[PDB]
Amino acid sequence: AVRFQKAMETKYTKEWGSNKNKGGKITDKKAKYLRLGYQQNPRKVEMAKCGAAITKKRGLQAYDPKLHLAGIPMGQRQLTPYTISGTDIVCDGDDLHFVNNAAMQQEWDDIRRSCVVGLDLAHEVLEKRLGKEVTPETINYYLEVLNHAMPGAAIVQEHMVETHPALVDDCYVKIFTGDETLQDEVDKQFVINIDNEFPANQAKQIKAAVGKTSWQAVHIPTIVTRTEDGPGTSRWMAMQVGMTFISAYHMCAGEAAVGELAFTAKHAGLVEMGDMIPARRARGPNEPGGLSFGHMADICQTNRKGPEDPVNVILQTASAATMLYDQIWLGGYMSGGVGFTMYATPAYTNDIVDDFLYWADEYASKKYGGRGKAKATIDTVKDIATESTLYSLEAYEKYPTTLEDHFGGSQRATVCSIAAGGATALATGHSQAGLSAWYLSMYLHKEAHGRLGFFGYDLQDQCGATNVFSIASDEGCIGECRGANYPNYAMNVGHQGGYTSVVAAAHAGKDAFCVNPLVKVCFADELINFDFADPRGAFGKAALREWDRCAGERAFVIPA
Template identity: 40%
Template sequence: MSQTRTSKENTVVEEGRYWDPHAVKGNIEKGKTWERMSIRDDCGNMFKSKFGDIDFTSKNTEYYRFNGVMQSKRKSEAWEIAKRITRERGIPNYNPDLHLHGVQMGQRMLQTYKITGLEREWAGAEDTPAHPGWVPGTGIYGIEMDDVNYENNMAMQQSRDDISRTSINGMNIPHETIERRFGKEVTPETINTYMEMLNHNLGAGALIQEHVTETNPELVKDCYAIMFTGDDEVADSIDPCFITNIDTHFPEYQAVQLKDQIKDKIYQVCRIPTMALRTSDGGLARAWVGQQASLAFVGAYDIPAGDAVTSDFVFTIKHGDVVFTGTALPYRRAQRVNSIGGVPYGYYADICQSSRTPEAIKGLDGGIDPVKVTVEALTPGCVLTDQGWLHNYLAGGSSSWASYVMSVYTDEVLEDPSYYGADWGMHHYKCGVGEVPNTLKNGMQIAEVVGQHFLASYDLYPAMCETHFGGSQRFLLQCAAIGAATGALTGDTDLGQTMWMYNTHIEKEHCMRLGFYGHDMQDQMGCGHNASYRSDQGSPYELRNMNFPDQAMHVGHVGGYVGICGGSAHARGAAYSTNPVIKLAFADHEHIQFDWRYPRREYGRGALHDFMPAGERTVVCPAYAGGITANIPPMYEKKR
């Protein structure tokens, strides 16, 4: 499953030599970073599309004279909307003249962005709930920074919702309770009946009662329940519409691993309505499913609802074998289970499904491509942990912070050094991905090569510094590239994360500084903590989350940890990073609203305002209510 690189023509650096930043121009002209992608050769075109006909290699900034926010279509539209709101409400609204206390912002270019990697997709053409008929290989260009702000991007919000609204229940304990305590037989027929009832009442309908209030199905059409199991015989006996077929959703070598871990256990995956999260948090998912699943069991197995044994049975549904996507947070955070702040990094990596796409299996010269998995998992990791959690929830608003993490999934900048490091390492160590010995010496060597390559890019293209607005953002990208390359070559998550921290010294030696306050403390102490045995410092990265000490405000960096967890697991041939149950629970791309196989594509569609979110209430809004009442049956019209 790994690919050995033998040709020197495919590498920029000769065997045994480090990258020479002073010779960067000559090396770039001679070869390509990766022969199938040629990202470095496209950098000029990318910057030309962003900055126009200017010399983007020049260090002269005379051309940075623009018309402030009026150069942005989105901000111009927002200003006009705000003026109307101010007139209607009588209270001042958005006013870009107040940026920087009224200082005119005419000197910075508000350039557009390109979503990375979409042209290289050759799969994923199936219709999905959010956007039917997507054509693989379609690029997304011209996105403004406001388009990827969390509040403006429906795909980003939906990715958070789909995690929080998921409830995973093991069914073996409830089935055993039914057979032993109630004397009922559990068969494929009763399971199918139960699933039909559960899908009826999970979102809209009522059970055990009649003529009671129910929900308009259009409001909750994103709500459903399915199952998966590692037992092929059991899976074949259940109605296909209720089962996730592991063999058809995963490559053969991954399917074998997953079924071996799940064995004969049956798991139920429920997505409660997205609109339910509007008034609650992720903890609602367990309570919601516990209530509705209990009623479905009562109806399917004819269980007496008021029997004393029923309370024991209900306990098995709500607490017996429940898998949460995220742990409950400390009291000061005021969030229950399934909050994005409590999702372990390894779970984020498993939620992302890019490791089972054809591009990740046969993308790197016919072999597995862990860099693809890293950068895809890194994207929702950054969006959700940084924009959705740190800035939107903890800091109290995510406006302006989207600019911080958008660099990891735009303009091909992260892919270039990541693939360069993987390509260099396969040639230098004469082995495939996941096969380089995971020694500290090798990790430091990879980190230094990739780090110097990245720093040389900023020297060659000053326009990159304009695109990446601060040292902390450039530090994030360099660390992510080093971690991606190290994890891809060694298959070792901890070594990849440690080299992320080691980069603090590489960059500080070059630039004399990193970013703002958090980086000097949290990242420089990371090398020691990664090797610590203390429980509050040295947990495996797959099991850490946003509430781990020293990382509660790790601005912009946690997404990188997520990507390294996913890419390293893929490099060593693993089907999942941390939990096979989580991996399988988010594999049903044909049902779930956000397609986790291609998170970058989904966020790009959200930026184009072309992603249809779930939980919309238009069917009961005034514009639609008139149409409903106008078509009521004549018998009711007479009564009115």
């Protein structure tokens, strides 16, 4: 059986809207082209009526499907739906554009608005300079005040303006710690309890990496991150951390020791999601270009909930990461317009990549005597990547409906390489081996079909094989530390979220994290608006306009 049977039947053999599709088989090679236009699709009709009303109200042309090139509107072929992979949620592509999907926006806001900041260095400043004694009692008062103050409320001065709590209810600070005594003595409202949130083997591995150190998981207001930018996050955090230390430790409200606390919060103790990127694409920290694939994989939380299905971990990671990197980052920040929804949807719709990756992992796990047991060698990579790619390409050839869904070669290439690279990284526990497989898959794919992706798709592809194991200045880089600013990767769709899934594959079901336990624990928190353990489910609920966890709206301070 193929995993995409149901989704292809929904898409092509059942009517959607008034598209008149009915019957047939998902293997059929021919189709009807009814030229119904946009009126076959209720969502497009809603859009068209909204556009005409905007044109009239503002006195300036807005959306009109008749303004397509040649005056021939979309829907000459039938307009067909998508199923969120692993679910029965069926929607239009229009429900999955980042602009139209509040969960997608909130995924990015929740990353952008977050940072991790140590406590140990700050406590050392207090001890060294003032001789203060730091105890669970002083920490608990600090955390109570910090949660009042962090959203933008006063604690020292008088007659002060403050942010309105009704607008900033998504802002808070929790703590996590490898010190088990401190974990138990801090008021539970504030604690991300590693033992509660992670399976025992994962908890042990996290605690070994963090030792006895203690950390703050800080989430600044969504309304602020949207007004400002990613580089604002650590600055916002540090202002209110500084204020709270002043009160909680009876300091002068502005003395030299406060300055050393500022340097602690803003630099020495700070873990940002990523750092700045270069001038041509200038952005500061906590923007998607600076986000390493290891950090993105560690933000995703599926591995702590379902490590027994590492393929699902990989697929959910691919979904959260591909949405961010291709839809919001490349298709938004770095370009815009209609953008790149459908370059990304193969990661999380219609069960096609899922079929291919489950197949390749079954192939490798049987061949190498169990999952994760293959040696990281040229021969292993060659084997898994070749047999995976052949399966995947033959599936597109056996099932015309899948070829038509992934109508752009870039989509097909991404799907194939996720399956080949992910299965190889999972078989070997080795991110580099997975990248090597990704590139071999592309090369096979190009020769099979006499085409690959869009005009510029395989820039990184063709640099790819030779740069996997290069040690050159701007080529050598372990996979977990590559990201959206790795030079070859800095421009093009179809890759960044896929590589994130390959990085995740090297660790899924084996390790608690890929590169940063501090990032991993930060996001292990149900109070975070976006569900990082089940991104597909959040995307789907928001596609239906039913997802209810949006933060940052101005509703409270504007008229109806």
